[PDB]
Amino acid sequence: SQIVLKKFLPGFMSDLVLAKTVDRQLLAGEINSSTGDSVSFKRPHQFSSLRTPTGDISGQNKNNLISGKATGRVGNYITVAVEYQQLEEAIKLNQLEEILAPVRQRIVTDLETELAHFMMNNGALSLGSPNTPITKWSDVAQTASFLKDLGVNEGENYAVMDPWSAQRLADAQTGLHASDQLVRTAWENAQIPTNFGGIRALMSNGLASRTQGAFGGTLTVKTQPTVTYNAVKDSYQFTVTLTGATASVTGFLKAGDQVKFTNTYWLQQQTKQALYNGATPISFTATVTADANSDSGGDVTVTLSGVPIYDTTNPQYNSVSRQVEAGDAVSVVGTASQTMKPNLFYNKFFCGLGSIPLPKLHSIDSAVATYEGFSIRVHKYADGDANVQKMRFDLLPAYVCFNPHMGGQFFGNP
Template sequence: MANDFDSNITRKLTRSFLNAFESNRVLSKNVNTQFLSNAFNPSTGDTVDIKRPTDYKSSRTSDGDISSGTAGSIITGKASGVVQDYFTVELDWAEADEAIKMDQLDQLIAPAATRIVTDLEVDFANFMRENTGLLAGTYGTAVTTWDDVAQAGAVMSSSGIPADQDWMYAVNPFTQTSLASNQRSLGAGGSAGGLISEAHRKAILSDDFAGMKVMTATTLSSATSHSVADRVGALASNPDVTYATAKDTMTQTLAVSGFGNNLQIRAGEVIQITGRNRLNLNTRQPIIDAAGVNVVFTATVTTAVTLSGTGTGNIVITGPAIFEAAGAYNTVDSAPVSTDVVTLLGAASTIYQPNLFWHKQAFSIGSVPIKKLFSTDTLGTTKDGLQIRVSKGASIRENKQIVRFDLRPAYGVLNPFFAGQGWG
């Protein structure tokens, strides 16, 4: 029987790929990552659900008699992870075989790994931008000082985000130039460890500033606002402000009117509702800023929409405005109602690229198990659970042999109130 080294070859390719893949990760190193073994099957479709934590209201009595009250309801919500498309790089096998023989495998494989990491992080950064629930600074104003960065830390603290895990802040590389003029903490570098990639180490500007790990990211996403100038309207009806409605998606639909005709609202843009103020999600008390005034409620548009020829339509936001009498999950100090002024922040025909800040448990990347195509395929998994399939095979139609690398992620928003857009 002839010798067969195919299985060993795909293992060599996998080792080389994983090393390069790990060394180029930045954003994906700083969110919840996991291998979703047994989470998906024909009955689940393309979605897997994760239970959200519950909360309750306490009561105060002088004698301990609570008979006049009612027991708090147990309301459980879920966060959904949705399977994304495959990220695939295909190489001609002859090139891979030659690289192995010439001991140049790393030089061949590294660009393939870099391409998948880059495409993954660009796609995921856009997902993050479109699913943040908080806002720090003035929308559209560039971050130029460390004080601007610290503002995001203040927003996270005052919003009641727990400090049980890392808080992160990602900036555009040109923002790093502005911050460098302050000569504070640049180049602090990351801590050593097997899960810290080379790109991640180089990206870190400060390991701990205002409670956050501050880093540069070249993959932050942007969008250009529509040319219609009239970006102020009003609620056309009272929105549903119950937690029971929002608990599974953490989104809310706002019926609006009075905006510019045919205004196109991009996913990731931010709206503000005048007269409705944010609550600390831990204390459920109003958030007061440095000037001693309430922080007005804002939310991020999750789904692009074009309003009608009369400026009416439905806007879907994340980070919903919840208000119930004695509610345990309230996010605002009063319920938004019909005729409340709604402003789409920013100006017309302007490109916006916000910095991002988040708690590690704000978002999740789950790696979906990929079936082997042949017995000689190799499945490699990073230490934090992202799985890569390496396959070698033949294309009968094209009369050639190929090797392919595949990753299939699932993205999830665990809590939009744990993340925000950062401005100056």
């Protein structure tokens, strides 16, 4: 119980798939010392046609030219710091290299966790009932089917599932009837193929979880919101008020809850026709961004991501069948207050991710560490005469959401 070996015992590690799949190309080295703390990209245009039977009609009602924006900004600092009596630390721990290994892992894990939170907070589309887990092939195929049905082509689709769910699919694959290669791989290595149901399925164990948040009562909208393209041409977010809630409860709607509008449907963005899900039309959904409470009288004011544009002066930008107006019936997906780990699906051009380089701090010893393409700035000092050394690690991230209507959550259905 005296002599100690120089090799540490192995530890636990998570996995990185979200950072590798998200778009790390558009936002790369544009947040410099010149542009500032935020930078914006442009949005594509759309046009509408008129139907007339005559030809000398040079004077009529024409279109309009409106341009959108998509702004990306920086996040908070990801700082991890340690202090120690340096001689007691160096008793048996040389070169101060032991701390280096499990701090970059912490930095990356926190980055990916908050990125997953960002994606589940900004995604709009939803599929299936949150209660039911993933069991069959259709539960994965429906994501690709929906993404194709909306009309997105330029990009590359993806989906992410937990470890337990994949085994359930590998077990389903072992029951195939004619594919010897597939049955062999599933029986031996329990590995599903790269392309599963038209979309790339990925397995990750590092994935954030969300609590529903208590709600109760038949909810409905009391005031007609403004969803004109002039208003929502910059953020695709809008504020709406609801009635019929509980008397007075804090946290009526948590962050990430999906609200479904019953009588307004999605549209095929190009052909401007409704979407039909085999047996029932697909309803429009939105995602809560910030926690919303309730006051006396059951009035809840909430801000949602994803806009049901039904502008009447610019018909070319419509994205829903009809207009949301007062008295409409709405619902919130899921049960009262269960907590679950959602499974994600998204296009390539959904959200970005970048990092801001950090310069050396004056008159302070420093160094740089690299870990899966992430650069971390380490600084060392001895502030105070307490004979206590201090080290700090720094990394700054930048995130953007290009189009909320190109991703979201998905579950299984009974």
